Amino acid sequence: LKIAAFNIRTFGETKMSNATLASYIVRIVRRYDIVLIQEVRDSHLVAVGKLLDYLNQDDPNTYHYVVSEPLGRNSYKERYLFLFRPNKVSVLDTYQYDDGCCGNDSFSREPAVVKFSSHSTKVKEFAIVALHSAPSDAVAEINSLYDVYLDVQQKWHLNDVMLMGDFNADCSYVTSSQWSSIRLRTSSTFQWLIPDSADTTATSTNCAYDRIVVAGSLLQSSVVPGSAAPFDFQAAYGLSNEMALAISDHYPVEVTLT
Amino acid sequence: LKIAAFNIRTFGETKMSNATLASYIVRIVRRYDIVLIQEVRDSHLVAVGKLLDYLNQDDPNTYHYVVSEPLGRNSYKERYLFLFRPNKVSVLDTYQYDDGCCGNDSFSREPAVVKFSSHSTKVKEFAIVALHSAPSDAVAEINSLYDVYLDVQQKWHLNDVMLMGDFNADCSYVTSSQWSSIRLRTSSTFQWLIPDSADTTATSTNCAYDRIVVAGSLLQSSVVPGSAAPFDFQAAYGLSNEMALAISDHYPVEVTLT
C-alpha cells in the first residue's frame, strides 16, 4: 500500500483550472492508494470537485474522499483532503480533533483523523492523523500531537497510528535545541520515518518540513524498510525549477506498507 | 523469571523481630527473583537489615537490594524496597521520580524506578515503576503514572516498563465510574495483568487493590499467559485467618517472565 502526504501550495480554483498544472497533480496523486492533501484553499469545494472530476473520469469509483471543514484561527483557512482508492482501503470512521475554542485552542488547523481498513497489509486497521502546522507555532503544535495520539487511543482503542503532514519540522521553525520540547519526539513510542537530514522542499532550501511518524508495533512492522522518502517530482519528470515551483514548493512524502 | 509486588503491613522492627513472622516473610520472598516490598516503616533501616540477614544467611550474595529514602507528604513515611537475585538480574540504573515540592507534588510516595538487565528472558532490559498509592488519592495517583511512563521513556528511551504495587485500585478507592479518569487505563499502550475481578487482600473484602501493568511489546511478549495472579499464602500454608493477617492484609501479586 502506498501512502503520501502532499502540501500543494495554494491548492484551489486558480490552480486546478490550469490543465497543465492539473495534469501533473493527477499524475502525482495516482501513484498512491492514500493521499493526504494540504493547503486546500477552497471554501466552496470547486477545486476539490475539479480534481475528483479528473480522478474518476473513467470510473466513478477510482477515488473516494474525506474532506474536513475549512480550518484556521485568524481569517485564512484550509481544509484537509484525504483521497483513497476504495478497492484498496475503506474508511471505518473519522473525527475532527477537538482542541478547544477563543485564546485556548492548541492548533491553527486541528487534526482531521481517519481510521482505515486495509486488507492487503499486515496491519488491518490503523488511523492517520493529519497536520499542516503553523510555522510560527511549529514546536507547540508538533508537541500537541502527543495529546492527539492519546485521544485516538481513548476513542478507538488503537495503538496503530500514522501522524503525517507539513509539520514545518526543520530550519527556522524547529531548531536544534527545540526537539527536547517535543513529546512526539522524546517519547520512544514513535518512530520518525522521514529523518532530519531529508529535503522535502521543491525550492533551494534543504529542510525536512514534511514528516511521517508511526506508533503501534503492528503498523511499525508493516512499513517496508527504506520506502519512506520525499518524492522529487522535479527530478522524476525532468521539470524546470519554475515549472516544479508552480506545482508546489514542497515534495510529497510517501511510505509503502506491506 | 518470577516477579512480585508485596505490601507487608507495617513492615518494620517489631514485625521482623518476631521469628515466626520473619520466617514466613522469608519464605514468601524466596519464591521470587525480584520482589518489590511496600509499607517499609523503617527510618533507620534496622528491619531491612534484619531481613537481609536472613536472606543472605548462607551466601552473602543470595539477594541484593535497592531502597528509596523514606517518602511521604505529611509525617507518616515509607520506603520502597526492591530485593533481587544477582545471579538472575542486574541493576542498570535507578532514579526517584521527581514529582515537585509544597502544595504541588503529584504523589504521597513518588515512584522509585529501577532498570534491570535480565539475560534469561526475551526482554533483556526493562524498568519497574513502584507505587504504593494513598487511598484517598488513588485515582489521581494512578492517573499520574501515565506521566511517569513518559519520564522513563525520555530518560532511558525504553518502552518496556512494568508498573506495579498497591494501587488501592478497587472498592471504595477507585469506583466504577472513575476508570474513565485514569490515562494509565484508557490508553491501550498498557495491559493490566491483574484484572478487576481479582482478590488481592488477605482480609474478608474482595478487592483488586494490588496490580501489575506492562507497556512495551517485547515485555508484553515475555509475560507467561495466565501467570499473573495474587499469591494466597493463607491457602498455600494452611494458615489461620489471624496468622495470615499478622503477616499482611494484602496478598503479594506475581507474574512470570519467559
Ligand SMILES: *[C@@H]1O[C@H](CO)[C@@H](O[C@@H]2O[C@H](CO)[C@@H](O[C@@H]3O[C@H](CO[C@H]4O[C@H](CO[C@@H]5O[C@H](CO)[C@@H](O)[C@H](O)[C@@H]5O)[C@@H](O)[C@@H](O)[C@@H]4O)[C@@H](O)[C@H](O[C@@H]4O[C@H](CO[C@H]5O[C@H](CO)[C@H](O)[C@H](O)[C@H]5O)[C@@H](O)[C@H](O)[C@@H]4O)[C@@H]3O)[C@H](O)[C@H]2NC(C)=O)[C@H](O)[C@H]1NC(C)=O
Ligand atoms: C499554466 O501553467 C504554466 C505554468 O505556470 C504556464 O506556462 C508559463 O507561461 C508563460 C507565458 O504565459 C511563459 O513565460 C514566459 O513569458 C513570456 C511573455 O512575454 C514577455 O515578453 C513580452 C514582449 O517581449 C518580447 O518577447 C520575447 C520573449 O519573451 C523577447 O525575447 C523579445 O525581444 C521581446 O522582449 C511581454 O509581453 C512581456 O511583458 C513578457 O515578459 C513568453 O513570451 C516567454 O516565451 C516566449 O513565447 C512566445 C510565444 O508566445 C506568443 O505566441 C502566441 C500566439 O500569438 C501567443 O498568443 C502569445 O500571446 C505570444 O506572446 C514566443 O514568441 C517567444 O519566442 C518566447 O520565447 C515565456 O513563455 C512560461 O515560461 C511558461 N512556463 C512553462 C514552463 O510552461 C501557463 O501560463 C499556464 N496556463 C495558461 C496559459 O493560462
Ligand SMILES: *[C@@H]1O[C@H](CO)[C@@H](O[C@@H]2O[C@H](CO)[C@@H](O[C@@H]3O[C@H](CO[C@H]4O[C@H](CO[C@@H]5O[C@H](CO)[C@@H](O)[C@H](O)[C@@H]5O)[C@@H](O)[C@@H](O)[C@@H]4O)[C@@H](O)[C@H](O[C@@H]4O[C@H](CO[C@H]5O[C@H](CO)[C@H](O)[C@H](O)[C@H]5O)[C@@H](O)[C@H](O)[C@@H]4O)[C@@H]3O)[C@H](O)[C@H]2NC(C)=O)[C@H](O)[C@H]1NC(C)=O
Ligand atoms: C509472634 O507472632 C505470633 C503471631 O502474631 C504470635 O502467636 C500468637 O500468640 C498468642 C499468645 O501470645 C496466642 O493468643 C492467645 O492468647 C491467650 C492469652 O491468654 C488469655 O487468657 C489469660 C488467662 O485466661 C485463661 O486462659 C485460657 C486460654 O486463653 C482460658 O481458656 C482459661 O479459662 C482462662 O481464661 C489472660 O492472660 C488473657 O488476658 C488472655 O486473653 C493464650 O493462652 C491462647 O492460648 C492458650 O495458650 C496457653 C499457653 O500459654 C501458657 O504457657 C506458657 C508457659 O508457662 C506461657 O508462659 C504463657 O505465659 C502461658 O499463658 C495454654 O495454657 C492454653 O491452654 C491456651 O489455649 C492464645 O495463644 C495466639 O493465638 C498466637 N497465634 C498464633 C496463631 O501463633 C506470637 O505472640 C509472637 N511472638 C512472640 C511470643 O512474642
Ligand SMILES: [Ca+2]
Ligand atoms: Ca484550531
Ligand SMILES: [Ca+2]
Ligand atoms: Ca530543497
Ligand SMILES: [Ca+2]
Ligand atoms: Ca511526594
Ligand SMILES: [Ca+2]
Ligand atoms: Ca480477600
